[PDB]
């Protein structure tokens, strides 16, 4: 009995952690028509209904979202998909040429003085012998002066030439799902107060994550998830001043953006099978596009956020909000996309308040841009064709990104400013409750039994 | 009908019990291994990886002379130099992960002994059958 011999088992439930390539999965509903869109191509296998969830008990596991994989992976995938979609479209090389430009005095309000320019130039036709004279309109933030007479040139001409966007394509995001192949498992921590790093006792396993909607924004987050208990704050090392802070809300807030102006369209021929789209004529009075939010909602939400934040820097402290410090036009202002357009809104009127110890609507203006270089790359620009008719969309605000400014001694006061700029954090705000593990079926143990001859 | 529900036995979730109870429920896991332009290339890599992983385990089980079963005995004698404790505690209060981290260092030798043991067994049996 005391003496014993080794024994072998198979299919033992033990696992470790590693990394591997994931794959996609899309709802069949999207497969129903809608053949034109940057994402949501048909290669994704159709999903399956009635997902199942298995509960575990007596387990405890450590999570660390800061040093997490499968973030850069989907970042790279998104960039590659964008580049692939953009490939087959006409080029825009011949437009680099001197222009003759003037103002536009058509009952413009005083705030728009010099914000539209009427320009004309020469351009070759299909037959290489002839040339023709054409004209168009432009915004101030796309043309530059060089040196009486008046002349102007494009802004990207000396840097690079880039492709005009194809006409029929859709930028609307849709839900997507991530799934792992056989021989791997995906674990989720269901604790409703887990602060993003450390132990977690309540765990479960799944095969495919819930829906995800890729969105591009800065200084805010739109159409995210909603917490369940209260506003939560997350960070790597809150004591350090060089790391951003993510704030996730408990309830949503509503926002309305609109461009009341009206536009038409026109087409021009450049060469064999080469078309070009240009702005037409305006019909009536013109006004600046703008956005609205409520007042009381914002007030109470800020109050709750301050109250929650107070639990780290002592109750005897002062808080002051300040606008963006300053810099280039891409981080200093909140940029977003709605209906195939790009706005740039000045958020000076939202972080202007102070807090000490113990039906009106806020309206803000925006501006329009037509040449874009996103993902902070160089040598790759785009052209956005104009659209006809007014536009208006509505969305939800769900999260904020803040950065604490430096201080001196204990001045019983602190300041925060909006930050951001890197799109990694936007992905990181979602995939902080998922881990990937690998199985190890073999096993060995001693046993009193002995093999028979 | 009105109160009757459904209670199935799922994937790996018994990993919170003693060292012994878990072994009663193993078969299920064994039946879940071979389940079956840049946006679609990686699937081929995944499939190749999966099949290679399965084949490696099949071969390794084949060599040790225990293929076709889930519980197999052998002849190599255990040595207390590798580990301590008695049968009671081991099979009453422990978890598989704890054992894994316990025996991590001394694995290659334990693997190695089995094939030479099997080779001696086979060689002796061959002459036992061939002597007549």
């Amino acid at each position, epitope marked *: 009995a005391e003496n014993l011999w080794v024994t072998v088992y198979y299919g033992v439930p033990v696992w470790k952690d590693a990394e591997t390539t994931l794959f996609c999965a899309s709802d069949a509903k999207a497969y129903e028509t809608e053949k034109h869109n940057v994402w949501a191509t048909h290669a994704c296998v159709p999903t399956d209904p009635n997902p199942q969830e298995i509960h575990l008990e007596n387990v405890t596991e450590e999570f660390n979202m800061w040093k997490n994989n499968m973030v850069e992976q989907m970042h790279t995938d998104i960039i590659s998909l964008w580049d692939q979609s953009l490939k087959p479209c006409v080029k825009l090389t011949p437009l680099c040429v001197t222009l003759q430009c003037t103002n536009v005095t058509n009952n413009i309000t005083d705030d728009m003085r010099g914000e539209l320019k009427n320009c004309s130039f020469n351009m070759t036709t299909e037959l290489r012998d002839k040339k023709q004279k054409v004209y168009s309109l432009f915004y101030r933030l796309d043309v530059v002066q060089i040196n009486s007479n008046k002349e102007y040139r494009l802004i990207n001409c000396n840097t690079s030439a880039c492709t005009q966007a194809c006409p029929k394509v859709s930028f609307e995001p849709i839900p997507i799902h991530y799934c792992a192949p056989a021989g791997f498992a995906i674990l989720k921590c269901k604790d409703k107060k887990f602060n993003g790093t450390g132990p977690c006792p309540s765990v479960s396993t799944v095969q495919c994550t819930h829906g995800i909607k890729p969105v591009v924004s800065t200084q805010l987050l739109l159409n995210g998830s909603l917490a369940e208990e209260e506003v939560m704050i997350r960070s790597e090392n809150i004591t350090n001043n060089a790391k951003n802070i993510l704030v996730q809300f408990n309830t949503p807030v509503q926002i309305n953006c609109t461009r009341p102006n009206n536009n038409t369209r026109k087409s021009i021929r450049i060469g064999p099978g080469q078309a070009f789209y240009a702005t037409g004529d305006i019909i009536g009075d013109i006004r600046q596009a703008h956005c609205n939010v409520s007042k009381a909602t914002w007030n109470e939400t800020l109050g709750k956020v301050v109250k929650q934040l107070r639990k780290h820097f002592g109750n005897n402290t002062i808080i002051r909000f300040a606008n963006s410090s300053g810099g280039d036009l891409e981080v200093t202002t909140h940029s977003f996309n709605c209906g195939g357009e790009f706005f740039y809104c000045n958020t000076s009127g939202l972080f202007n308040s102070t807090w000490i110890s113990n039906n009106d609507s806020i309206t803000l203006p925006c501006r329009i841009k037509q040449i874009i270089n996103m993902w902070q790359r160089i040598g790759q620009c785009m052209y956005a064709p104009p659209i006809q008719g007014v536009i208006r969309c509505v969305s939800n605000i769900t999260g904020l990104i803040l950065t604490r400014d430096g201080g001196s001694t204990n001045s019983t006061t602190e300041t925060f400013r909006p930050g951001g700029g890197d799109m990694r954090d936007n992905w990181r705000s979602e995939l902080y409750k998922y881990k990937v593990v690998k199985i190890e079926p073999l096993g060995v143990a001693p046993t009193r039994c002995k093999r028979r001859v | *009908a*009105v109160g009757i*529900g459904a*209670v199935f*036995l799922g994937f790996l*979730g018994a990993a919170g019990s003693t060292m012994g109870a878990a072994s009663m429920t193993l078969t299920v896991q064994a039946r879940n291994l071979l389940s079956g332009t840049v946006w679609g290339i990686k699937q081929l890599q995944a499939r190749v990886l999966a099949v290679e992983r399965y084949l490696r385990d099949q071969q390794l089980l084949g060599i040790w002379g225990c293929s076709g079963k889930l519980i197999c005995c052998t002849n190599v004698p255990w040595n207390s130099s590798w580990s301590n404790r008695n049968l009671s505690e081991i099979w009453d209060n422990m978890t598989w992960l704890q054992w894994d981290k316990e025996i991590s260092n001394y694995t290659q030798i334990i693997y190695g002994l089995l094939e030479e043991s099997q080779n001696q067994q086979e060689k002796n049996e061959q002459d036992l059958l061939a002597l007549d």
Partner: antibody
Amino acid sequence: QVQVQESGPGIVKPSETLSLTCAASRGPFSGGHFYWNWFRQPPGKGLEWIGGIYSDGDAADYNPSLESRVAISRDRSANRFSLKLISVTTTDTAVYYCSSTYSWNNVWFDQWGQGVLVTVSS
Amino acid sequence: DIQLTQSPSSLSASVGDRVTITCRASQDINTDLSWYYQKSGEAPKLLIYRASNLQGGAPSRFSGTGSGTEFTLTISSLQPEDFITYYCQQRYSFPITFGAGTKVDIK
């Protein structure tokens, strides 16, 4: 092999509110849809039904007898559930049991309980 | 709703005899019923699942048959521990009705 237990106060007085709680363990099975039922045994009869509830949702289904007084809630934190009764009266003289049911492969075990005296009198 | 009748409603069956218990529903319930057995000092338990089907693990001493609104359980011999109350319960649309309770006494 699930073990289910109940508790409660002494002899409550009529015109007051009674409360009770029950705890059950998932035990051997991993994932399922365990169902819970509440019952009482008044003297001189058989059993009387006091409703039931699933283990996955707080929604409670009551019984025809006293629907304006019953209040059943599910405690997700500890896998528990509470049963409360307003306008208590001496008519509630009984021994209360807390039962649960699986659906294990067409066997349908049950672990009715042990009982607890919940009589009412001033 | 649905009402049932159990016979013998009050029988003091002498120990060591074959004993039969009949339960008849009011309206047809197809085949949806179960039988339970209970005694004081403990809680109720199940003796027959599905009625027509025999409960898994129940003693072979008890057997059951029936259909519709007529079912009958036969016990090959009355043990000392079998002097208990039996209930036929319909597993059909709401509400849920239980057996009247046929206590088996000693004589």
